Amino acid sequence: VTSVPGVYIEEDASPAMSVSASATAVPLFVARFTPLKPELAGVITRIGSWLDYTILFDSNVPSSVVDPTASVALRLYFQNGGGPCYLYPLEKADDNGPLAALPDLIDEVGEITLLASPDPDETYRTAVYGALAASLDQHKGYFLLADSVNGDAPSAVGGSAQVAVYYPNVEVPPLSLPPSALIAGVYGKTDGERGVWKAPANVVLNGVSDVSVRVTNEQQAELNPKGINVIRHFSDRGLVVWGSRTQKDDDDWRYIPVRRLFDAAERDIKKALQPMVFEPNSQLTWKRVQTAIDNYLYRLWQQGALAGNKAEEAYFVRVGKGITMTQDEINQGKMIIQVGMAAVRPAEFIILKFTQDM
Amino acid sequence: VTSVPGVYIEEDASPAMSVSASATAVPLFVARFTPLKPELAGVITRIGSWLDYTILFDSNVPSSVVDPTASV
Amino acid sequence: AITADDIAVQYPIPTYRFIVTLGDEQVPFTSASGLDINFDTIEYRDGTGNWFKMPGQRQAPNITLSKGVFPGKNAMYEWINAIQLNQVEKKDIMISLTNEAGTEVLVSWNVSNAFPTSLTSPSFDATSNEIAVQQITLMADRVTIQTA
Amino acid sequence: AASITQTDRTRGVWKAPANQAVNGVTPAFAVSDDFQGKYNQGKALNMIRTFSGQGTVVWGARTLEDSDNWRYIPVRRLFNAVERDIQKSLNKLVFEPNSQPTWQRVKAAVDSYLHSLWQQGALAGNTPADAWFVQVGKDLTMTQEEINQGKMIIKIGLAAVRPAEFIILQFSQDI
Amino acid sequence: VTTTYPGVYLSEDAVSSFSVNSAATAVPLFAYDSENTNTINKPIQVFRNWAEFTVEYPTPLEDAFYTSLSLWFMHGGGKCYLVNEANIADAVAQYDDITLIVAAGTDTTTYTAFTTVVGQGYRIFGLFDGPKEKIAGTAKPDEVMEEYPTSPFGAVFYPWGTLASGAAVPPSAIAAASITQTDRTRGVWKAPANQAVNGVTPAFAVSDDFQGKYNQGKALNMIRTFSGQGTVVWGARTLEDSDNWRYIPVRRLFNAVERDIQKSLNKLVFEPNSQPTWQRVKAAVDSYLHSLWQQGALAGNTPADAWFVQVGKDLTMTQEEINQGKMIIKIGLAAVRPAEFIILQFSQDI
């Protein structure tokens, strides 16, 4: 309604929200989002900032004892470290039509890394976690952020290394939210400031005040030798995410930062070698591919990602015809590359051992 | 017994001991050392620090007028 | 493989590109120095051994701008000539590290209430090959940094 | 209107016009405390009373809206002074190119105004982070569809000081 | 009063006020009995000052939880917790802030939940109670002290109070209010004994020859009145009479050190378990222990005799323990013991 070329004044605005930039934590929040224009009802839309959410989606949605919590969960996402933030509005749980078409729509968009469905209903998430469980073991690099109900895994994703469960529901001034919308925020904050090789487990959660269940040490002692990753309350600090384990009990893929380092390195090598597809499958191309991986793995080692001291102890790239291939495999049009890395594990136990003898 | 990822506190520890590095003085102490696991009973074992001695060998060995002096 | 959109995020900013908004107009300058934030220090010691170190009150910045002499009118001269015994049109200075084209401000320095205290004419020399460069010093009260 | 003049000169627009003594005039009627107590809520008659001491002041500083935001004539006239003085400063930046260097020059012309206003006691916070905020961006306050229309959207928030209206004395004979 | 007109009000109702002058090393838990009738049915409730306490309890009661808290807040006192006796083992494990467990007229249920959180290792110090009846003097002192634990984390504080409104203050609260004024002015390493608690008097008069039977072993820790320093607690020993963990000062000194070091090292958890991190851990402790030494808390007139901190790859932990995620420090530090006996030897010879 601006027509006079002067300066206009409004008086009951809401404060705007900042958004960060990250390439390793791009989530897909599956919740009960209510669109304004109904063409984006069964598709995935990109929400670059909070201002993009208020134009495309209804951000008020007045309550009726039920309370809409999907718009509240995104405000806590951008307060904890924003992102490009893909959304999939899925209204009710039991419609097995759009849930069967969900993993085929995720692959059409190139850049989803995290899943993290932020919904307070329990049977809603079980229908989502079961529909996404088959896409986690297909080497596509996704990472599910599940939520425990009473202190255990939701059993649709039992022991895969692509899943990080987070137990306590987090209360907002009081509606209780599942913590996956906030933890998806603190991944983007940690990766931008420290890298994917850093454990995302000392970040103080902005926004929220208190968790729904104050968890002691003795019940975390039976939970942390599973991947449960309790949100703890410390009196001097506030609400600190406390735990960086996955569902896999293997010695290799036990920790979140070791797992997401390999998922991010495989994703960036894949984006670098796609210009080298449909090249002539010759020894000149195999050295151009080996150098493009060796240049990438060197600049991870010199910024602290890989656990080495010589750069021959951190990584290796191997390609050849006597090595890693046979002549029958070149003739069917493929090259086979062996890449290895060595990551560093976090220190999660500190023993003090006091005395007064000297 | 560490399972909680916090910080643990013990209160009756003994002070640790430092070890140096040398290549010209490497001794072979032949004394009455009492092993914990009995496979290293008649062989020669390398003890890189005092912490390696407390894990492989019994370092307390309570006395009975005789007194164990190999750990001292 | 640095892909220069990442240079705009991760590499440091050089000094040779800056715009100076002097009041309500932009004036081209060659140099700009002295935009410091300095504090004093208050100390206290007793006999038991306690040393107490505290920041004092921040003192005024002294800002040096220098530009060349042009054939038009001298805009830095009519702002130092219009002094009446304490009266001066105090201006706010913005010095912005800028993009190459001038369409992005990277990091800028804000100056609150600046007024001139000196204006040095160039040294004329018949055996020199230089530009007539005036050098104005300003007295201000605070210097802030906004980063966008 | 004559107590507003003497308040805005000496104490400022953020201070209440109540205890300023207007001279040469007396109220036609005498008003007690129990009469004003019925009218201090809601739509706020704002009595004019005389006192031995501070003679014939206005007594009350409320507006016609009894909300948590826009009660108290100080905090309404404070924002009207801020809203007029910011738009007097930003009228010299109209018809500038709608670009990111101009948005930086707008939000620093406001931070320079609000800092000098904060340090003279008008704003409520003992740090600049709790006293005001100014923000403007390309996907913070406005979108690209709004840049192409010629719009420059700022948003400014700032906190005011509320006056002390009730002083309760509690006497006792115990030490 | 009800505020209508903008003037100045006058009221003469009975009010009271106490200012908070708290110390951070004394955040107590006041245990009350489960068989109590005049409490709010909330099992755990949080009171930050005297103003918040009189909202939930607007009338002066006589029960043992009220006289403990009214004697708490009138000597400064910060935030504190009312937990019923069947939940004190949970509240210590949940609220992370508790340093004292104050048995406010409570026995045999606080005691069995005191020894739970000590074996779990929650760095607390218990303040128990003596008998409410008078100890005779032919009492056989091992039979009086048989209901109490033998842990070094507790003390008993026998003589009950007789607060000036007539009510009876539990003697744990008399000890808990001298801890507050000691930790603020003198520190946690100084004994809470000669601090004068005000507004309360002991119910009984105790002589020196009565306390001499109880000063050994399990240490009743008398509350006595003196002309001069009026109504102080008299005794500073714990329930364990050892050369290490006698003296309530040197126990509460290490509990303050053990909590403040782990508050500083929780920000270094989930760092990479490497040699640059071990250097950053042991310098975060040496910076803490040096500032603690120079304010008189540690016993040694050099940093070499006051504390040591050491961590290494074959000093405190092995490679099998690095791979488990463990970082083993070991810290030793010396405390100052108080002067408990002053012997005067007079003579008529020069």
DSSP result, C45-91: E-SSS-EEEEE------EEEEEEE--SS--TTHHHHS--BTTB---E
Give the DSSP letter of residue D160: B
Q: Beta strand pairing status for A175-177 and A170-172?
A: antiparallel
The burial of B49, by beta-carbon neighbours within 10 Å (0-12 exposed, 13-18 middle, 19 or more buried), is given as middle
**Which residue on chain A is closest to B4 by alpha carbon?**
A221
With b for 16 or more beta-carbon neighbours within 10 A and e for fewer, the E103-128 pattern comes to: bbbbbebbbebbbebbeeebbbbbbb
The burial of E17, by beta-carbon neighbours within 10 Å (0-12 exposed, 13-18 middle, 19 or more buried), is given as exposed
CA pair distance C29, C35, nearest whole angstrom: 15
Residues E213, E199 contacting (CB under 8 angstroms): no
CB-CB: which of D59, D169, D172 is closest to E6?
D59
CA dihedral angle for residue E207, residue E208, residue E211, residue E213, rounded to 10 degrees: -120
Instruction: Identify the CA nearest to B6 among candidates A68, E323, E267.
Output: E267
- C5 CA: distance to closest CA in chain A (Å): 12
Residue E13 in contact with partner chain D when CB distance is under 8 A: yes
Q: H/E element holding D8?
A: helix D2-10
Give contacts of A47 with chain D, Cβ < 8 Å. Answer: none
Residues E290, E297 contacting (CB under 8 angstroms): no
DSSP reduced 3-state for E9: strand
Give the DSSP letter of residue D66: -
DSSP reduced 3-state for E180: helix
- A68 CA: distance to closest CA in chain E (Å): 30
Residue found under tokens 């001499």: E212
Instruction: Identify the CA nearest to B5 among candidates E260, E308, E16, A232.
Output: A232
CA pair distance C130, E306, nearest whole angstrom: 68
Residues E125, E255 contacting (CB under 8 angstroms): yes
What is the secondary structure of A54-90 as a DSSP string?
HHHB-S----------HHHHHHHHHHT-----EEEE-
Residue B14 in contact with partner chain A when CB distance is under 8 A: yes
Residues E175, E192 contacting (CB under 8 angstroms): yes
Instruction: Identify the CA nearest to A109 among candidates A82, A137, A88, A129.
Output: A88
Best interface-test mutation with B: which of A231, A350, A358 has the largest number of B CBs within 10 A?
A350
Q: Beta strand pairing status for E307-310 and E330-333?
A: antiparallel
Kindly list the distances between the CA atom of residue E61 and the CA atoms of B65, E51, E169, in Å, as whole numbers in the listed order.
67, 16, 12
Both tokens of residue A137?
């073991």
- B52 CA: distance to closest CA in chain E (Å): 8
Best interface-test mutation with D: which of A2, A7, A14, A17 has the largest number of D CBs within 10 A?
A7
Q: What number of C-beta contacts closer than 8 Å exist between B and E?
A: 43
Residues A18, A78 contacting (CB under 8 angstroms): yes
Give contacts of C9 with chain A, Cβ < 8 Å. Answer: 21
- A125 CA: distance to closest CA in chain C (Å): 38
CB-CB: which of D33, D41, D170 is closest to E13?
D170
> Phi/psi at E143 (nearest 5 deg)?
-85, -20
Is the alpha carbon torsion for A347, A349, A351, A352 positive or negative?
A: positive
Residues A357, B13 contacting (CB under 8 angstroms): no
CB-CB: which of D34, D36, D166 is closest to E9?
D166
Give contacts of D142 with chain A, Cβ < 8 Å. Answer: 51
Give contacts of E14 with chain D, Cβ < 8 Å. Answer: 172
Give the DSSP letter of residue A274: G
Strand partners, E8: D167
Instruction: Identify the CA nearest to D136 among candidates D113, D152, D117, D124.
Output: D152
DSSP reduced 3-state for E174: helix
Report CB contact under 8 Å: B16, E330: yes
Report CB contact under 8 Å: A350, B8: yes
Both tokens of residue E19?
């200012």
Best interface-test mutation with A: which of E270, E280, E293, E309 has the largest number of A CBs within 10 A?
E270
The type of residue at A272 is: A
Best interface-test mutation with A: which of B1, B3, B54 has the largest number of A CBs within 10 A?
B3
**Contacts with A354 (C-beta within 8 Å, 6 or more apart), sequence order:** B9, B10, B11, B13, E254, E257, E258, E330, E331, E332, E333
Resolution, in Å, please? 2.8
Report CB contact under 8 Å: A52, D155: no
CA pair distance E212, E235, nearest whole angstrom: 11
DSSP reduced 3-state for A319: coil
Residues E338, E249 contacting (CB under 8 angstroms): yes
CA pair distance B43, E138, nearest whole angstrom: 66
Is the alpha carbon torsion for E74, E79, E85, E88 positive or negative?
A: negative
Best interface-test mutation with D: which of A1, A9, A51 has the largest number of D CBs within 10 A?
A51
CA pair distance D77, D81, nearest whole angstrom: 6
CA pair distance C45, E286, nearest whole angstrom: 23
CA pair distance E185, E173, nearest whole angstrom: 19
Catalogue the E-assigned strands of E70-212: 80-84, 100-103, 125-127, 154-155
CA pair distance E23, A152, nearest whole angstrom: 40
At what angle are helices A70-79 and A180-193 packed, to 10 degrees?
Answer: 20
Report CB contact under 8 Å: E329, A353: yes
Kindly list the distances between the CA atom of residue C145 and the CA atoms of A335, C36, C96, C142, E232, in Å, as whole numbers in the listed order.
53, 10, 10, 10, 58
The burial of B53, by beta-carbon neighbours within 10 Å (0-12 exposed, 13-18 middle, 19 or more buried), is given as middle
Give contacts of E5 with chain D, Cβ < 8 Å. Answer: 33-34, 36-37, 40
Is the alpha carbon torsion for C63, C64, C68, C74 positive or negative?
A: positive
Give contacts of D101 with chain C, Cβ < 8 Å. Answer: 19, 96, 98, 102-105
- D85 CA: distance to closest CA in chain A (Å): 12
Both tokens of residue E202?
């002991």
Report CB contact under 8 Å: D37, E5: yes
Residue found under tokens 């209903």: A121
Give contacts of D109 with chain C, Cβ < 8 Å. Answer: 92
Residues A56, A40 contacting (CB under 8 angstroms): yes
Residues D94, A4 contacting (CB under 8 angstroms): no
Q: What number of C-beta contacts closer than 8 Å exist between D and E?
A: 43
CB-CB: which of D33, D61, D172 is closest to E15?
D172
Q: Is there an interface between E and D (3+ Cβ pairs < 8 A)?
A: yes
CA pair distance E105, E31, nearest whole angstrom: 8
Both tokens of residue A227?
């991947």
CA pair distance D18, D10, nearest whole angstrom: 13
> Phi/psi at D163 (nearest 5 deg)?
-80, 165
> Phi/psi at E83 (nearest 5 deg)?
-125, 130
CA pair distance A181, A206, nearest whole angstrom: 12
Q: How many CB atoms lie within 10 A of CB A134?
A: 9
Give contacts of A358 with chain B, Cβ < 8 Å. Answer: 15
Report the neighbours of A using a cutoff of 3 or more CB pairs below 8 angstroms: B, C, D, E
Report CB contact under 8 Å: D108, C148: no
Residue found under tokens 């019925």: D38
Instruction: Identify the CA nearest to A356 among candidates B59, B18, E289.
Output: E289
For chain B, the first-to-last Cα distance in angstroms comes to 30
Long-range contacts of the stretch C69-72 (C-beta < 8 A, 24+):
C69/C122, C69/C131, C69/C132, C69/C133, C69/C134
**Which residue on chain D is closest to C22 by alpha carbon?**
D105
Strand partners, A317: A339
With b for 16 or more beta-carbon neighbours within 10 A and e for fewer, the D104-129 pattern comes to: bbbbbbbbbbbbebbeeebbeeeeee
Could you tell me where the DSSP H helices lie in chain A? 50-56, 70-79, 96-100, 102-108, 122-131, 180-193, 217-220, 256-273, 283-301, 327-331
Give contacts of A355 with chain B, Cβ < 8 Å. Answer: 11-15
Q: How many CB atoms lie within 10 A of CB C94?
A: 22
Residues E337, E236 contacting (CB under 8 angstroms): no
**Which residue on chain D is closest to A14 by alpha carbon?**
D155
CA pair distance E16, E51, nearest whole angstrom: 9
Q: Beta strand pairing status for E326-328 and A349-351?
A: parallel
Report CB contact under 8 Å: E5, D168: no
CB-CB: which of E96, E273, E326 is closest to A234?
E96
**Which residue on chain B is closest to E262 by alpha carbon?**
B7
CA pair distance A127, E5, nearest whole angstrom: 61
Report CB contact under 8 Å: A16, D137: yes
Residues A346, A254 contacting (CB under 8 angstroms): no
Report CB contact under 8 Å: C9, A21: yes
CA pair distance E214, E139, nearest whole angstrom: 11
Across the beta sheet with A354-355, the strand order is A354-355, E330-333, E307-310
Residue D175 in contact with partner chain E when CB distance is under 8 A: no
Q: Is there an interface between C and D (3+ Cβ pairs < 8 A)?
A: yes
- Side-chain half-sphere exposure of D76, counting CA atoms within 13 A: 14
Give contacts of D105 with chain C, Cβ < 8 Å. Answer: 21, 94
Q: H/E element holding A145?
A: strand A144-147
**Contacts with D112 (C-beta within 8 Å, 6 or more apart), sequence order:** C92, C110, C112
- D105 CA: distance to closest CA in chain C (Å): 8
Residues D93, D113 contacting (CB under 8 angstroms): no
- C8 CA: distance to closest CA in chain A (Å): 13
Best interface-test mutation with E: which of B9, B11, B49 has the largest number of E CBs within 10 A?
B9
Method used to obtain the model: cryo-EM
Kindly list the distances between the CA atom of residue E103 and the CA atoms of E91, E153, E157, E219, E246, in Å, as whole numbers in the listed order.
14, 13, 11, 17, 21
**Which residue on chain A is closest to E89 by alpha carbon?**
A216
At what angle are helices E110-120 and E88-95 packed, to 10 degrees?
Answer: 30
